[PDB]
Each structure stands twice: as structure tokens, then as C-alpha cells.
Design a protein around this ligand. Structure first.
Ligand code: M4Z
Ligand code: NAG
Ligand code: NA
Ligand code: NA
Lengths: 27, 10, 249
């Protein structure tokens, strides 16, 4: 499955404005 | 205040 | 969503709008889990205290949306419901325990840049991400305030809160089928889901495989964005066995 990979973000290797905030919280 | 949706969707 | 921001285009392509046919209005949020299945909160469909009891033919699912009100010609797809499935042990009487429902679409939806399903967590993804302090993301077209209505889809990132802190914030009994999220009054940052956001997804981006997983469903709260209060979410992984059963038919 190609679930949870967004055509306009992950599929293009583009990051949205706040996703880094989520990653940084995964300490 | 919702725009009408095409008749095809009932 | 209270104290959020406008979503970016294609930011939440699994976002589904549950739309009441008559009067034409927003019912709830929901999420796309496959080309044929939509996940929502049971209370969006069945809620006896407010005389809510929807059947398949009462509503439509609108997928690929950004604007709340406009018909997004060449972007959104509108689907009809074949069948609704509410968790058999959904508890609307007390605390909305097992607030979960599946909806089968009449025809499969075609994926696009704006329409794409979210992943559902496995045991390990759930164990590694469902941790106090870890942030998730809530999206919806719900109220901007507890007592405004947005033009476009709203987004807010919120930390998962420790179970004793959730339990201590309310008189309502909390179960293992729910979790709470939001900032404490000391943290400064704000945000919460609100009425109209129900049924929407609480998602997290796995740092292991970079895929987005739906960990929660917007379920309930007491007011919106009140200090010392937190939003409550259905714990998706705890009910995955019911999800798999209904899908396997
Ligand atoms: C708008 C204010 N509404 C309430 O406080 C109603 N509060 C009740 C409630 O939330 N619901 C019964 C059906 C569902 C509902 O209204 N969901 C919408 C909602 C409300 C708040 C939040 C939140 N702040 N995260 C998210 C979604 C809850 C009161 C405490 C016992 C459980 C139900
Ligand atoms: C809801 O509606 C259906 C008929 O549309 C009915 O069979 C059911 O008993 C109603 N109430 C509840 C609480 O399920
Ligand atoms: Na308590
Ligand atoms: Na709060």
C-alpha cells in the first residue's frame, strides 16, 4: 500500500510547514 | 452558506 | 479547530467531510482509509441525547476538500454510502467509549494529489508513537471558537498528555480506548478540536518509514480550548481488531 504518503509532500520530497514540530517531539 | 452540489449526487 | 492555522493544499489528503444532504450542512470530519472505506466517530452517526440517528441515504462523503463551503469543481469527489457500521459496544450513554464507525462507499474513490488514504497503525507503530509529549495533528472544518466558522480546512499540532493528567482534568471516566491531547496552561501554546471536528483524524508521521498514521479520532471534550482541559480521542489501534473484522466482512 501507498498509504500515508502524500502526493504533494512525501511523493515529491517536500515538507509541510509544521511537520518538523511533530518529528522534534519524537524524542 | 454551503454552495449547491451537482444534482447527480442527489 | 480553535487556535489552529489554515491547512496547506494537499496537506491532509485523507481528510473527509461528512455532509448532511438536507439541510445542506457540515455534519463531521472523517478519514479515508482505502478507496472504499471511510473512518469516523460513532457519535457523528448515532447520538440519542441530541436525537442524532443517521442512515446511509441521509448523507454524503466529500473527499479532497480544502474550502468548507464551496463546491471544489475538478478537485473534490462526492460519494454515496453503501453501508454504515457502528462499533457494537459504542457507549453513548456515559463517556463515548469506543466512539468509532466505518462507512462503505458505493463506488471506489479515485486517488489524486488531493485524495489519498492514511495508514492505520500496527501494534509496534502504536507502541512507539503513542507517548506523552509526542505531538500529533488534528484537522477539521469545525468551530474556530467554543461560543467563528473557517473558510478553509484548519490544522493544529497537539501533544499527547499523560493518562493521570487526562483523568485529573475531568469528572468523566476515561477508558483505555481513549487518549487525551493538548497543551497545559503553563506551556503557552494553545489549540483544540471543537464542535464540527468530530470524527476527524489525529495523525502522526512515523520517523521510521515517513508515513502518516491515524492514531486517533476526534471524539469529545468539555468546551473547546479551555485551560486545564484537554481534547479526547478514540484510540484507533485499541479497536483495530473490530476495524479488520468489518473490512474482512
Ligand atoms: C463544543 C462544546 N461541546 C461540549 O463540550 C460537549 N461535550 C460532550 C461531547 O463532547 N460530546 C457529545 C457528542 C460529543 C461532541 O460534542 N463532540 C464534539 C467535540 C466537543 C469538544 C471537543 C474538544 N474540545 N476537543 C471535540 C469535539 C462530552 C461531555 C462530557 C461527557 C462526554 C461527552
Ligand atoms: C436508529 O435508527 C434505526 C432505523 O433507522 C433503528 O433500527 C434504531 O433502533 C434507532 N436507534 C438506535 C439507538 O440505534
Ligand atoms: Na477525574
Ligand atoms: Na486546554
Amino acid at each position: 500500500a501507498d498509504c500515508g504518503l502524500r502526493p504533494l509532500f512525501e511523493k515529491k520530497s517536500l515538507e509541510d510547514k509544521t511537520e518538523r514540530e511533530l518529528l522534534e517531539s519524537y524524542i | 452558506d454551503f454552495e449547491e452540489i451537482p444534482e447527480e449526487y442527489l | 479547530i480553535v487556535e489552529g492555522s489554515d491547512a496547506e493544499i494537499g496537506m491532509s489528503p485523507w481528510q473527509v467531510m461528512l455532509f448532511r444532504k438536507s439541510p445542506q450542512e457540515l455534519l463531521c470530519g472523517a478519514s479515508l482509509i482505502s478507496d472504499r472505506w471511510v473512518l469516523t466517530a460513532a457519535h457523528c452517526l448515532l447520538y440519542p441525547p441530541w436525537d442524532k440517528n443517521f442512515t446511509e441515504n441521509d448523507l454524503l462523503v466529500r473527499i479532497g476538500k480544502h474550502s468548507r463551503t464551496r463546491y471544489e469543481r475538478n478537485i473534490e469527489k462526492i460519494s454515496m454510502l453503501e453501508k454504515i457500521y457502528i462499533h457494537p459496544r459504542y457507549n453513548w450513554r456515559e463517556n463515548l467509549d469506543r466512539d468509532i464507525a466505518l462507512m462503505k462507499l458505493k463506488k471506489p474513490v479515485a486517488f489524486s494529489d488531493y485524495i489519498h488514504p492514511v495508514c492505520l497503525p500496527d501494534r509496534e507503530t502504536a507502541a512507539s508513537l503513542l507517548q506523552a509529549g509526542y505531538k500529533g495533528r488534528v484537522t477539521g472544518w469545525g468551530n474556530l471558537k467554543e461560543t467563528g466558522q473557517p473558510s478553509v480546512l484548519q490544522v493544529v499540532n497537539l501533544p499527547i498528555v499523560e493518562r493521570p493528567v487526562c483523568k485529573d482534568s475531568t469528572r468523566i471516566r476515561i477508558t483505555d480506548n481513549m487518549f487525551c491531547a493538548g497543551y497545559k496552561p503553563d506551556e503557552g501554546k494553545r489549540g483544540d478540536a471543537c464542535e464540527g471536528d468530530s470524527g476527524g483524524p489525529f495523525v502522526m508521521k512515523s520517523p521510521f518509514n515517513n508515513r502518516w498514521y491515524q492514531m486517533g479520532i476526534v471524539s469529545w471534550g468539555e468546551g473547546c480550548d479551555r485551560d486545564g482541559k484537554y481534547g479526547f480521542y478514540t484510540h484507533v489501534f485499541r479497536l483495530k481488531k473490530w476495524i479488520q473484522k468489518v473490512i474482512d466482512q
